[PDB]
C-alpha cells in the first residue's frame, strides 16, 4: 500500500514516504534492541522530519547521527513507518532498512 | 526587484548571517541539505542556530560551527542557506541562495 523510497547522499540519507489519501505516517527510529525513538524538531541526533510541497514526508538522517550504525562496511539505519487513520488507529506498520556505502 | 543586502561573518565558535530588508519587509532563513530539502530556522540551542533582530533593522541568523546542519568540506565549515525576502502578509518577494563557508577562502 504505502509508497516509499530512500536515497543515499554524501553526508546523510533521505527517506521519502507518500501515505494514502487522508492517512498519516509516524516515524520511529529503531535501535538494535528494538527501542523506537520518536523523531523531534530540535534534537542532537541529526535527524529531521519535513513535508514537501507534495503530500510526501521527508526523513533526513546524517551518517554521523545517533542510531546510524556501521555493519560490514556500510551505513545502516532501521526506521519504522506507522501508516495511520484519522481516528488514530494504525492501519499498517512498515520496517525499512536504509543501507548506504562507506569507505 | 531583488535587491536585498546581506553578508555573513565568520567567528570563533560560529558564523553570523546578516540581512537588512527594506520597506518593512522581513527575512525567513532556510537551511538547504544536499537533497534540496529546506529546513526553516527556529531557535534551537541543541542545533546551535538562533534568530535575532538587531537594534537596527537587520535580521541575524547565527549558526555554531558544530551545529547539526553544518558540514566540513575541504577543511571548512559549510552551510547553504536560502533567504526568503517576505512581506508581512507572508508572501515571498524574492529568494536568495548563499553558501556560508568559514573560515573564508
Ligand atoms: C516542527 O514545528 C512545526 C511548527 O513549528 C510543526 O508544524 C511540525 O509539526 C514540527 N515537527 C515535529 C513536531 O516533528
Ligand atoms: C532566540 O535566541 C536568541 C539568541 O539566544 C535570543 O536573543 C532570542 O531572544 C531568542 N528568542 C526569540 C528570537 O524569540
Ligand atoms: Zn532516488
Ligand atoms: Zn536513482
Ligand atoms: Zn505513533
Ligand atoms: Zn538519528
Ligand atoms: Zn558583518
Ligand atoms: Zn579569537
Ligand atoms: Zn517562513
Ligand atoms: Zn535545525
Ligand atoms: Zn518559503
Numbering used by the authors:
A (entry chain B): 25 to 127
B (entry chain A): 23 to 127
Structure paper excerpt:
Vertebrate oocytes are surrounded by a specialised extracellular coat that is referred to as zona pellucida in mammals (ZP) and vitelline envelope in non-mammals (VE). Although their fine morphological appearance differs between classes, all vertebrate egg coats consist of filaments made up of a variable number of glycoprotein components that polymerise using a common ZP module. Accordingly, a recombinant construct corresponding to the predicted ZP-N1 domain of cZP1 (cZP1-N1) is secreted both as a monomeric and a disulphide-bonded dimer, whereas a protein encompassing the trefoil domain and C-terminal ZP module of cZP1 (cZP1L600-R958) does not form intermolecular disulphides. Thus, by recapitulating the oligomeric status of full-length cZP1, cZP1-N1 harbours its cross-linking function.
Examination of the zinc-SAD data used for phasing revealed that asymmetric interaction of the cZP1-N1 homodimer moieties creates a negatively charged pocket where H71(A) coordinates a Zn2+ ion that faces the C269(A)-C390(A) intramolecular disulphide, as well as the C66 cross-link. The anomalous difference map of the data also shows a peak near H71(B) but, consistently with the much lower accessibility of the latter due to crystal packing, this site is weaker than the previous (~6 σ vs. 11 σ). In the Zn2+-soaked crystal, where H71(A) adopts a different orientation and is too far from C390 (A) to make an hydrogen bond, the C269(A)-C390(A) disulphide is partially reduced (most likely due to radiation damage) and H91(A) adopts two alternative conformations, one of which no longer stacks against W72(B) and chelates the Zn2+ together with H71(A) itself. Accordingly, molecular dynamics (MD) simulations suggest that, in solution, the two His residues can stably coordinate a zinc ion together with four water molecules. Taken together, these observations indicate that homodimerisation of hZP1 depends on the same His residues that form a Zn2+-binding site in cZP1-N1. The observation that a Zn2+ ion can be bound by two His residues of cZP1-N1, one of which is invariant (cZP1 H71/hZP1 H82) and the other almost completely conserved (cZP1 H91/hZP1 H102), also raises a possible connection with the zinc spark response of mammalian oocytes to activation. The presence of a conserved Zn2+-binding site in ZP1, together with the finding that mutation of the two Zn2+-binding His severely impairs homodimerisation of hZP1-N1, suggests that zinc ions released by the zygote could modulate the architecture of the ZP by altering the conformation of its ZP1 cross-links.
